[PDB]
């Protein structure tokens, strides 16, 4: 598709056998979700946003389905205002910005 | 919302 | 340009007669710069994100060049970590997600 941005570019993602939705976000380095069904251990990771820094849960090599593709990437679980797919996963689906 | 994220 | 996402998508902006650079941010509804010098009246706004809420000045109907292209729009001004171009401006320059 060619997604315009007259609205949030939200796509559907399948992670841990739950359908979630998240915003294709070119201004985030990483993928960050609020709650996900991921059973295993994770590592402590600090991220930066606009108001300060949050500590998040880093799960590596997670199998995830975004808009029709099965992808493997790092997925972070943190206090994000909305679910967000970052460049780590957008690159893997070949997503570019055009203008 | 401003979802700028640095990691 | 077709811009890949292996690195931050940063572009030249031209605001208040200053060459600056800013991050095309599809996860931001609004546009936010570090402190710059603008004519016009401002009204205060609180904007949210990772790390919580920040108080900014909202300037209306501001002229600005993004990668050479002049567009007019609401520009927020505040103690952002980095210059951010939001969906409000990106829609004016014809910017789309592609995959």
XYZ file of N, CA, C and O in Angstrom:
820
model
N 0.810 -1.207 0.000
C 0.000 0.000 0.000
C 0.847 1.262 0.000
O 2.051 1.235 0.311
N 0.199 2.370 -0.323
C 0.787 3.676 -0.136
C -0.072 4.394 0.882
O -1.187 4.812 0.573
N 0.409 4.428 2.124
C -0.353 4.992 3.236
C -0.104 6.478 3.390
O 1.014 6.893 3.662
N -1.160 7.268 3.222
C -1.158 8.683 3.600
C -1.324 8.800 5.100
O -1.572 7.817 5.769
N -1.161 10.002 5.635
C -1.048 10.159 7.084
C -2.071 11.144 7.581
O -1.864 11.808 8.602
N -3.164 11.257 6.833
C -4.266 12.054 7.285
C -4.788 11.451 8.557
O -5.530 12.104 9.268
N -4.428 10.222 8.828
C -4.665 9.613 10.119
C -3.474 8.828 10.592
O -2.655 8.506 9.806
N -3.415 8.491 11.871
C -2.407 7.549 12.360
C -2.297 6.302 11.466
O -3.295 5.639 11.194
N -1.078 5.969 11.015
C -0.896 4.756 10.223
C -0.799 3.540 11.131
O 0.288 3.147 11.538
N -1.959 2.990 11.476
C -2.039 1.838 12.347
C -2.259 0.609 11.493
O -3.152 0.575 10.644
N -1.452 -0.412 11.746
C -1.665 -1.721 11.141
C -1.977 -2.776 12.192
O -1.878 -2.524 13.391
N -2.419 -3.941 11.736
C -2.682 -5.069 12.628
C -1.413 -5.924 12.789
O -0.667 -6.085 11.820
N -1.118 -6.356 14.011
C 0.015 -7.256 14.242
C -0.419 -8.464 15.067
O -1.290 -8.359 15.934
N 0.125 -9.629 14.724
C -0.134 -10.835 15.503
C 1.117 -11.152 16.297
O 2.187 -11.342 15.729
N 0.978 -11.117 17.618
C 2.072 -11.437 18.521
C 1.547 -12.170 19.762
O 0.575 -11.742 20.398
N 2.146 -13.327 20.038
C 1.678 -14.240 21.085
C 0.255 -14.750 20.899
O -0.466 -14.948 21.882
N -0.159 -14.948 19.645
C -1.521 -15.386 19.335
C -2.605 -14.412 19.764
O -3.739 -14.810 20.024
N -2.244 -13.132 19.892
C -3.229 -12.052 20.029
C -3.076 -11.098 18.853
O -1.963 -10.736 18.473
N -4.195 -10.719 18.252
C -4.190 -9.628 17.293
C -4.031 -8.338 18.070
O -4.780 -8.051 19.012
N -3.019 -7.568 17.695
C -2.877 -6.234 18.236
C -2.835 -5.248 17.099
O -2.746 -5.637 15.937
N -2.969 -3.972 17.429
C -2.730 -2.953 16.432
C -1.732 -1.921 16.903
O -1.560 -1.695 18.111
N -0.961 -1.427 15.941
C 0.133 -0.540 16.266
C 0.410 0.393 15.119
O 0.108 0.107 13.961
N 1.001 1.521 15.471
C 1.158 2.615 14.554
C 2.531 2.513 13.904
O 3.535 2.408 14.604
N 2.557 2.386 12.571
C 3.831 2.388 11.847
C 4.535 3.705 12.109
O 4.071 4.751 11.671
N 5.625 3.665 12.868
C 6.169 4.894 13.411
C 7.617 5.120 13.037
O 8.526 4.636 13.726
N 7.824 6.009 12.070
C 9.157 6.289 11.556
C 10.063 7.090 12.518
O 11.275 7.201 12.304
N 9.470 7.610 13.591
C 10.175 8.433 14.570
C 10.518 7.608 15.797
O 11.003 8.114 16.804
N 10.310 6.303 15.702
C 10.787 5.444 16.760
C 11.794 4.419 16.248
O 11.573 3.734 15.252
N 12.954 4.383 16.889
C 13.931 3.344 16.604
C 13.377 1.916 16.811
O 13.636 1.015 16.018
N 12.545 1.732 17.829
C 12.157 0.402 18.228
C 10.654 0.187 18.286
O 9.855 1.141 18.338
N 10.295 -1.096 18.365
C 8.916 -1.516 18.527
C 8.592 -1.597 19.997
O 9.327 -2.204 20.764
N 7.511 -0.940 20.392
C 7.175 -0.810 21.798
C 5.680 -1.041 21.987
O 4.850 -0.303 21.446
N 5.355 -2.041 22.810
C 3.976 -2.373 23.162
C 3.749 -2.269 24.667
O 4.674 -2.412 25.461
N 2.487 -2.067 25.038
C 2.072 -1.929 26.437
C 2.015 -3.264 27.185
O 2.652 -3.415 28.223
N 1.171 -4.191 26.697
C 1.135 -5.558 27.217
C 1.067 -6.533 26.043
O 0.380 -6.285 25.044
N 1.886 -7.579 26.128
C 1.868 -8.659 25.158
C 1.985 -9.989 25.880
O 2.624 -10.085 26.926
N 1.413 -11.019 25.273
C 1.566 -12.389 25.738
C 2.910 -13.018 25.336
O 2.974 -13.799 24.386
N 3.978 -12.640 26.036
C 5.316 -13.184 25.811
C 5.828 -13.824 27.102
O 6.057 -13.123 28.090
N 5.926 -15.164 27.118
C 6.133 -15.911 28.367
C 7.523 -15.830 28.985
O 7.647 -16.033 30.209
N 8.554 -15.605 28.161
C 9.938 -15.828 28.618
C 10.591 -14.654 29.337
O 9.992 -13.594 29.513
N 11.846 -14.833 29.730
C 12.596 -13.733 30.307
C 12.834 -12.629 29.293
O 12.732 -12.823 28.078
N 13.172 -11.462 29.820
C 13.423 -10.299 29.001
C 14.593 -9.570 29.639
O 14.904 -9.816 30.801
N 15.248 -8.692 28.889
C 16.269 -7.840 29.484
C 15.840 -6.371 29.633
O 15.098 -5.847 28.796
N 16.225 -5.740 30.764
C 16.084 -4.313 31.070
C 16.673 -3.425 29.975
O 17.843 -3.570 29.604
N 15.872 -2.494 29.474
C 16.369 -1.577 28.462
C 15.807 -0.171 28.669
O 14.619 0.005 28.949
N 16.678 0.828 28.595
C 16.240 2.204 28.727
C 15.976 2.790 27.334
O 16.759 2.585 26.393
N 14.839 3.473 27.197
C 14.527 4.144 25.938
C 14.283 5.618 26.209
O 14.047 6.021 27.357
N 14.435 6.434 25.175
C 14.135 7.849 25.295
C 12.924 8.240 24.481
O 12.751 7.802 23.336
N 12.115 9.115 25.077
C 10.932 9.686 24.409
C 10.981 11.193 24.577
O 12.054 11.754 24.821
N 9.837 11.868 24.427
C 9.825 13.336 24.476
C 9.891 13.941 25.895
O 10.449 15.018 26.089
N 9.378 13.221 26.890
C 9.337 13.770 28.252
C 10.349 13.209 29.231
O 10.361 13.589 30.397
N 11.187 12.278 28.801
C 12.083 11.646 29.759
C 12.418 10.253 29.303
O 12.276 9.938 28.130
N 12.843 9.412 30.234
C 13.317 8.093 29.878
C 12.523 7.065 30.645
O 12.215 7.257 31.822
N 12.134 6.012 29.938
C 11.462 4.878 30.538
C 12.283 3.607 30.458
O 12.931 3.318 29.454
N 12.159 2.790 31.491
C 12.745 1.458 31.470
C 11.711 0.457 30.921
O 10.548 0.454 31.342
N 12.123 -0.352 29.949
C 11.208 -1.255 29.251
C 11.722 -2.687 29.256
O 12.893 -2.942 29.573
N 10.848 -3.621 28.880
C 11.204 -5.043 28.802
C 11.616 -5.453 27.395
O 10.793 -5.469 26.485
N 12.868 -5.866 27.230
C 13.359 -6.197 25.897
C 13.309 -7.698 25.618
O 14.034 -8.470 26.246
N 12.416 -8.102 24.709
C 12.303 -9.492 24.283
C 12.931 -9.617 22.897
O 12.564 -8.874 21.987
N 13.856 -10.559 22.728
C 14.609 -10.666 21.481
C 14.074 -11.769 20.576
O 13.571 -12.790 21.057
N 14.217 -11.572 19.264
C 13.895 -12.610 18.282
C 12.444 -13.085 18.329
O 12.168 -14.259 18.150
N 11.532 -12.169 18.609
C 10.120 -12.481 18.685
C 9.528 -12.672 17.289
O 9.712 -11.834 16.410
N 8.788 -13.777 17.094
C 8.062 -13.956 15.838
C 6.781 -13.126 15.798
O 5.945 -13.232 16.692
N 6.657 -12.271 14.792
C 5.556 -11.323 14.742
C 5.030 -11.224 13.323
O 5.797 -11.297 12.374
N 3.714 -11.086 13.182
C 3.100 -10.937 11.866
C 2.582 -9.521 11.690
O 1.688 -9.085 12.420
N 3.159 -8.796 10.736
C 2.676 -7.463 10.405
C 2.194 -7.382 8.972
O 2.844 -7.904 8.059
N 1.018 -6.765 8.805
C 0.374 -6.647 7.484
C 0.778 -7.751 6.482
O 1.187 -7.462 5.346
N 0.637 -9.012 6.889
C 0.817 -10.142 5.965
C 2.182 -10.820 5.958
O 2.366 -11.857 5.313
N 3.151 -10.238 6.664
C 4.487 -10.814 6.688
C 4.797 -11.357 8.074
O 4.497 -10.713 9.077
N 5.386 -12.547 8.140
C 5.950 -13.013 9.406
C 7.371 -12.463 9.581
O 8.237 -12.705 8.745
N 7.601 -11.693 10.641
C 8.918 -11.097 10.856
C 9.522 -11.438 12.224
O 8.792 -11.668 13.183
N 10.847 -11.521 12.299
C 11.526 -11.692 13.581
C 12.271 -10.416 14.006
O 13.171 -9.932 13.315
N 11.943 -9.910 15.189
C 12.552 -8.683 15.663
C 12.489 -8.551 17.162
O 11.827 -9.310 17.846
N 13.227 -7.586 17.666
C 13.139 -7.205 19.051
C 11.839 -6.418 19.284
O 11.423 -5.613 18.462
N 11.141 -6.740 20.363
C 9.910 -6.059 20.699
C 10.053 -5.643 22.155
O 10.506 -6.433 22.990
N 9.760 -4.378 22.431
C 9.940 -3.816 23.755
C 8.570 -3.633 24.391
O 7.583 -3.351 23.717
N 8.496 -3.862 25.691
C 7.236 -3.736 26.391
C 7.382 -2.647 27.441
O 8.167 -2.791 28.373
N 6.657 -1.545 27.275
C 6.875 -0.391 28.139
C 5.670 0.506 28.317
O 4.609 0.239 27.753
N 5.841 1.606 29.071
C 4.757 2.577 29.250
C 4.655 3.551 28.073
O 4.886 4.747 28.231
N 4.321 3.028 26.896
C 4.069 3.856 25.726
C 2.590 4.227 25.618
O 1.718 3.399 25.868
N 2.302 5.508 25.336
C 0.939 6.018 25.145
C 0.138 5.271 24.085
O -1.079 5.142 24.208
N 0.811 4.781 23.053
C 0.139 3.956 22.072
C 1.124 2.927 21.495
O 2.339 3.088 21.605
N 0.595 1.790 21.048
C 1.453 0.748 20.512
C 2.169 1.229 19.286
O 1.572 1.830 18.405
N 3.447 0.908 19.200
C 4.238 1.469 18.141
C 5.226 0.460 17.537
O 5.934 -0.257 18.261
N 5.153 0.323 16.213
C 6.149 -0.395 15.435
C 7.247 0.557 14.935
O 6.973 1.526 14.216
N 8.483 0.262 15.319
C 9.623 1.122 15.009
C 10.366 0.689 13.746
O 9.920 -0.201 13.005
N 11.509 1.319 13.506
C 12.263 1.079 12.286
C 12.904 -0.306 12.228
O 13.057 -0.861 11.141
N 13.252 -0.871 13.386
C 13.753 -2.246 13.442
C 12.858 -3.238 12.696
O 13.355 -4.087 11.975
N 11.543 -3.076 12.796
C 10.615 -3.962 12.100
C 10.116 -3.407 10.781
O 9.662 -4.149 9.928
N 10.138 -2.096 10.623
C 9.658 -1.525 9.379
C 10.616 -1.808 8.223
O 10.195 -2.102 7.114
N 11.910 -1.749 8.508
C 12.932 -2.118 7.537
C 12.736 -3.536 7.031
O 12.996 -3.804 5.866
N 12.260 -4.432 7.893
C 12.146 -5.844 7.537
C 10.963 -6.108 6.637
O 10.949 -7.101 5.921
N 9.969 -5.230 6.661
C 8.882 -5.361 5.702
C 9.096 -4.479 4.469
O 8.256 -4.447 3.573
N 10.258 -3.835 4.393
C 10.631 -3.031 3.225
C 9.879 -1.712 3.165
O 9.570 -1.196 2.078
N 9.519 -1.196 4.339
C 8.711 0.020 4.409
C 9.607 1.243 4.218
O 10.631 1.355 4.886
N 9.278 2.094 3.245
C 9.980 3.362 3.044
C 9.050 4.571 3.190
O 7.842 4.445 3.031
N 9.620 5.733 3.501
C 8.918 7.003 3.380
C 9.193 7.631 2.020
O 10.330 7.654 1.555
N 8.158 8.177 1.398
C 8.284 8.739 0.065
C 7.622 10.103 0.009
O 6.548 10.304 0.584
N 8.257 11.024 -0.716
C 7.685 12.334 -0.970
C 8.625 13.071 -1.915
O 8.190 13.619 -2.966
N -0.318 13.298 20.321
C 0.827 12.527 20.887
C 2.066 12.642 20.011
O 1.970 12.692 18.783
N 3.219 12.716 20.664
C 4.504 12.759 19.982
C 5.328 11.544 20.374
O 5.949 11.509 21.432
N 5.176 10.506 19.555
C 5.778 9.186 19.712
C 7.163 9.234 19.104
O 7.434 8.542 18.129
N 8.018 10.124 19.592
C 9.411 10.036 19.191
C 10.059 9.056 20.167
O 9.752 9.083 21.365
N 10.819 8.100 19.638
C 11.419 7.083 20.495
C 12.861 6.787 20.097
O 13.134 6.385 18.971
N 13.770 6.960 21.052
C 15.187 6.708 20.843
C 15.612 5.518 21.706
O 15.421 5.520 22.921
N 16.235 4.523 21.079
C 16.728 3.350 21.810
C 18.078 2.813 21.328
O 19.126 2.899 22.034
N 12.316 11.983 -3.010
C 13.062 10.934 -2.323
C 12.239 9.698 -1.959
O 11.109 9.801 -1.472
N 12.842 8.530 -2.156
C 12.446 7.343 -1.420
C 13.433 7.070 -0.285
O 14.621 6.810 -0.519
N 12.942 7.178 0.946
C 13.803 7.173 2.110
C 13.654 5.884 2.904
O 12.576 5.568 3.415
N 14.758 5.157 3.039
C 14.756 3.890 3.745
C 14.870 4.164 5.236
O 15.152 5.280 5.645
N 14.647 3.145 6.053
C 14.491 3.402 7.460
C 15.565 2.729 8.264
O 15.392 2.479 9.450
N 16.693 2.478 7.611
C 17.826 1.873 8.282
C 18.492 2.867 9.223
O 19.363 2.489 9.996
N 18.138 4.137 9.121
C 18.624 5.217 9.973
C 17.458 6.144 10.216
O 16.503 6.031 9.549
N 17.536 7.047 11.168
C 16.493 8.035 11.382
C 16.159 8.780 10.086
O 17.036 9.052 9.279
N 14.870 9.034 9.827
C 14.607 9.841 8.638
C 14.672 11.354 8.903
O 13.667 11.995 9.223
N 15.861 11.923 8.746
C 16.073 13.324 9.112
C 16.160 14.164 7.853
O 16.704 13.713 6.842
N 15.538 15.336 7.871
C 15.534 16.192 6.684
C 15.783 17.658 7.034
O 15.587 18.066 8.172
N 16.195 18.457 6.053
C 16.387 19.880 6.314
C 15.044 20.561 6.492
O 14.080 20.241 5.799
N 14.954 21.394 7.539
C 13.848 22.337 7.626
C 14.345 23.760 7.668
O 15.500 24.034 8.009
N 13.447 24.654 7.292
C 13.761 26.048 7.129
C 12.683 26.791 7.865
O 11.546 26.884 7.387
N 13.031 27.295 9.042
C 12.031 27.874 9.912
C 12.552 29.116 10.624
O 13.617 29.101 11.265
N 11.809 30.207 10.475
C 12.189 31.468 11.070
C 13.483 31.927 10.437
O 14.302 32.582 11.087
N 13.693 31.511 9.187
C 14.914 31.825 8.456
C 16.153 31.130 8.983
O 17.261 31.648 8.862
N 15.964 29.964 9.597
C 17.091 29.158 10.074
C 17.063 27.765 9.452
O 16.035 27.083 9.496
N 18.184 27.357 8.864
C 18.314 25.997 8.361
C 18.494 25.060 9.535
O 19.460 25.170 10.274
N 17.538 24.166 9.723
C 17.584 23.226 10.827
C 17.376 21.846 10.242
O 17.009 21.711 9.073
N 17.567 20.812 11.050
C 17.105 19.500 10.619
C 16.118 18.835 11.580
O 16.103 19.121 12.783
N 15.226 18.023 11.029
C 14.128 17.514 11.821
C 13.814 16.087 11.427
O 14.174 15.661 10.341
N 13.139 15.347 12.298
C 12.919 13.944 12.032
C 11.486 13.732 11.537
O 10.532 14.127 12.205
N 11.331 13.204 10.319
C 9.991 12.876 9.851
C 9.441 11.802 10.763
O 9.972 10.697 10.815
N 8.410 12.159 11.513
C 7.907 11.323 12.572
C 6.447 10.950 12.298
O 5.521 11.731 12.560
N 6.223 9.759 11.766
C 4.854 9.353 11.496
C 4.068 9.018 12.749
O 2.841 9.011 12.719
N 4.769 8.811 13.864
C 4.111 8.591 15.154
C 3.838 9.873 15.929
O 3.465 9.818 17.101
N 4.053 11.032 15.304
C 3.650 12.281 15.936
C 2.520 12.979 15.189
O 2.606 13.220 13.983
N 1.441 13.269 15.906
C 0.286 13.928 15.307
C 0.621 15.369 14.933
O 0.132 15.884 13.926
N 1.505 15.975 15.731
C 1.802 17.403 15.667
C 3.279 17.607 15.377
O 4.083 16.695 15.542
N 3.647 18.836 15.018
C 5.042 19.136 14.745
C 5.646 19.930 15.877
O 5.015 20.843 16.378
N 6.867 19.567 16.275
C 7.510 20.143 17.458
C 8.986 20.428 17.206
O 9.759 19.509 16.932
N 9.378 21.695 17.374
C 10.781 22.092 17.265
C 11.379 22.540 18.592
O 10.666 23.015 19.480
N 12.698 22.399 18.704
C 13.470 23.065 19.762
C 13.365 24.551 19.541
O 13.098 25.005 18.427
N 13.684 25.321 20.568
C 13.346 26.728 20.510
C 13.903 27.525 19.332
O 15.088 27.476 18.991
N 12.965 28.132 18.624
C 13.255 28.856 17.409
C 12.531 30.189 17.540
O 11.714 30.389 18.457
N 12.861 31.113 16.646
C 12.337 32.460 16.741
C 11.288 32.805 15.691
O 11.594 32.990 14.503
N 10.041 32.888 16.167
C 8.881 33.091 15.309
C 8.091 34.339 15.679
O 7.893 34.637 16.856
N 7.637 35.073 14.656
C 6.628 36.098 14.818
C 5.252 35.428 14.835
O 5.099 34.270 14.394
N 4.255 36.182 15.286
C 2.919 35.649 15.498
C 2.659 35.509 16.984
O 3.591 35.492 17.798
N 1.384 35.424 17.340
C 1.020 35.042 18.698
C 1.126 33.535 18.944
O 0.865 32.719 18.059
N 1.485 33.175 20.169
C 1.422 31.781 20.596
C 0.340 31.543 21.653
O -0.089 32.474 22.338
N -0.149 30.309 21.715
C -1.013 29.859 22.786
C -0.369 28.585 23.362
O 0.338 27.880 22.644
N -0.495 28.360 24.686
C 0.200 27.212 25.307
C -0.491 25.892 24.982
O -1.704 25.878 24.823
N 0.274 24.818 24.796
C -0.315 23.491 24.619
C 0.452 22.426 25.401
O 1.675 22.479 25.516
N -0.264 21.449 25.936
C 0.401 20.312 26.534
C 0.368 19.110 25.591
O -0.700 18.685 25.141
N 1.547 18.607 25.234
C 1.627 17.450 24.348
C 2.260 16.244 25.027
O 3.126 16.386 25.887
N 1.781 15.059 24.665
C 2.166 13.831 25.343
C 3.051 12.915 24.529
O 3.268 13.123 23.341
N 3.565 11.885 25.178
C 4.401 10.911 24.504
C 5.061 10.056 25.569
O 4.644 10.052 26.736
N 6.037 9.273 25.135
C 6.852 8.467 26.028
C 7.598 9.411 26.973
O 8.318 10.318 26.520
N 7.457 9.174 28.277
C 8.116 10.008 29.284
C 7.191 11.077 29.846
O 7.548 11.812 30.762
N 5.989 11.164 29.298
C 4.968 12.027 29.864
C 4.771 13.283 29.046
O 5.094 13.322 27.864
N 4.283 14.326 29.704
C 3.709 15.474 29.026
C 4.675 16.661 29.005
O 5.412 16.887 29.965
N 4.728 17.370 27.876
C 5.516 18.595 27.810
C 4.701 19.796 27.349
O 3.872 19.691 26.444
N 4.943 20.922 28.017
C 4.318 22.211 27.724
C 5.042 22.911 26.573
O 6.263 23.063 26.590
N 4.289 23.338 25.566
C 4.883 23.928 24.372
C 4.090 25.156 23.946
O 2.959 25.371 24.386
N 4.687 25.953 23.073
C 3.989 27.071 22.465
C 3.444 26.597 21.125
O 4.182 26.046 20.311
N 2.158 26.843 20.895
C 1.530 26.570 19.609
C 1.468 27.841 18.768
O 0.852 28.829 19.173
N 2.149 27.822 17.623
C 2.061 28.880 16.615
C 1.214 28.438 15.418
O 1.506 27.422 14.785
N 0.219 29.248 15.059
C -0.648 28.907 13.941
C -0.210 29.478 12.602
O 0.335 30.586 12.529
N -0.460 28.701 11.552
C -0.340 29.179 10.184
C 1.096 29.613 9.903
O 1.351 30.576 9.174
N 2.025 28.804 10.412
C 3.447 29.042 10.273
C 4.000 28.505 8.945
O 3.820 27.325 8.619
N 4.723 29.360 8.196
C 5.415 28.955 6.971
C 6.766 28.256 7.215
O 7.637 28.762 7.936
N 6.965 27.115 6.568
C 8.169 26.341 6.821
C 8.511 25.432 5.665
O 7.638 24.957 4.939
N 9.805 25.228 5.478
C 10.263 24.480 4.346
C 10.843 23.185 4.829
O 11.574 23.126 5.821
N 10.316 22.126 4.235
C 10.693 20.790 4.607
C 11.288 20.213 3.357
O 10.602 20.047 2.352
N 12.608 20.094 3.380
C 13.334 19.525 2.267
C 13.177 20.405 1.021
O 13.257 19.924 -0.114
N 12.986 21.704 1.246
C 12.847 22.662 0.149
C 11.416 23.116 -0.104
O 11.184 24.219 -0.606
N 10.453 22.266 0.242
C 9.043 22.531 -0.041
C 8.369 23.387 1.019
O 8.258 22.992 2.179
N 7.795 24.502 0.586
C 7.112 25.385 1.509
C 5.736 24.833 1.848
O 4.981 24.434 0.961
N 5.448 24.743 3.144
C 4.107 24.420 3.618
C 3.787 25.279 4.822
O 4.664 25.876 5.437
N 2.517 25.365 5.148
C 2.088 26.282 6.168
C 1.393 25.370 7.141
O 0.895 24.327 6.728
N 1.518 25.633 8.434
C 0.887 24.747 9.393
C 1.170 25.090 10.841
O 1.919 26.008 11.141
N 0.536 24.351 11.739
C 0.737 24.564 13.157
C 2.114 24.037 13.533
O 2.513 22.966 13.098
N 2.906 24.879 14.164
C 4.201 24.447 14.615
C 4.231 24.623 16.129
O 3.880 25.688 16.637
N 4.555 23.543 16.832
C 4.845 23.580 18.267
C 6.308 23.838 18.589
O 7.208 23.397 17.886
N 6.540 24.540 19.690
C 7.883 24.986 20.047
C 8.099 24.684 21.522
O 7.308 25.099 22.376
N 9.126 23.892 21.814
C 9.297 23.387 23.171
C 10.621 22.688 23.395
O 11.431 22.560 22.472
N 10.846 22.221 24.635
C 12.092 21.559 24.979
C 12.021 20.084 24.596
O 12.170 19.188 25.441
N 11.752 19.851 23.308
C 11.949 18.557 22.701
C 13.433 18.191 22.701
O 14.293 19.055 22.554
N 13.726 16.886 22.905
C 14.965 16.181 22.622
C 15.480 16.384 21.191
O 16.692 16.359 20.976
N 14.573 16.496 20.221
C 14.962 16.677 18.822
C 13.798 17.296 18.065
O 12.649 17.213 18.500
N 14.114 17.948 16.952
C 13.113 18.469 16.044
C 12.326 17.361 15.363
O 12.894 16.381 14.898
N 11.010 17.521 15.329
C 10.114 16.465 14.877
C 9.134 17.074 13.894
O 8.509 18.079 14.198
N 8.997 16.494 12.710
C 7.938 16.904 11.814
C 6.808 15.896 11.947
O 7.026 14.697 11.737
N 5.609 16.379 12.286
C 4.438 15.502 12.471
C 3.604 15.248 11.227
O 3.943 15.708 10.128
N 2.485 14.546 11.413
C 1.576 14.175 10.316
C 0.893 15.392 9.710
O 0.599 15.408 8.509
N 0.640 16.386 10.563
C 0.085 17.675 10.166
C 0.870 18.353 9.038
O 0.276 18.814 8.061
N 2.203 18.319 9.126
C 3.052 18.835 8.032
C 3.330 17.817 6.927
O 3.420 18.180 5.751
N 3.522 16.558 7.304
C 3.921 15.545 6.333
C 2.835 15.327 5.294
O 3.119 15.009 4.140
N 1.588 15.507 5.714
C 0.461 15.422 4.811
C 0.478 16.574 3.812
O 0.009 16.423 2.687
N 1.048 17.711 4.200
C 1.092 18.856 3.296
C 2.178 18.689 2.253
O 2.049 19.182 1.136
N 3.238 17.968 2.598
C 4.289 17.730 1.623
C 4.097 16.482 0.775
O 4.868 16.269 -0.148
N 3.045 15.699 1.044
C 2.704 14.533 0.196
C 3.398 13.247 0.613
O 3.510 12.289 -0.159
N 3.886 13.251 1.852
C 4.676 12.138 2.380
C 3.811 10.910 2.676
O 2.800 11.032 3.353
N 4.207 9.739 2.157
C 3.457 8.491 2.364
C 4.328 7.331 2.875
O 5.497 7.243 2.526
N 3.765 6.427 3.677
C 4.424 5.145 3.931
C 4.251 4.191 2.760
O 3.155 4.036 2.253
N 5.323 3.538 2.335
C 5.233 2.603 1.211
C 5.835 1.217 1.494
O 6.963 1.109 1.962
N 5.080 0.154 1.208
C 5.665 -1.198 1.219
C 4.934 -2.223 0.349
O 4.351 -1.863 -0.682
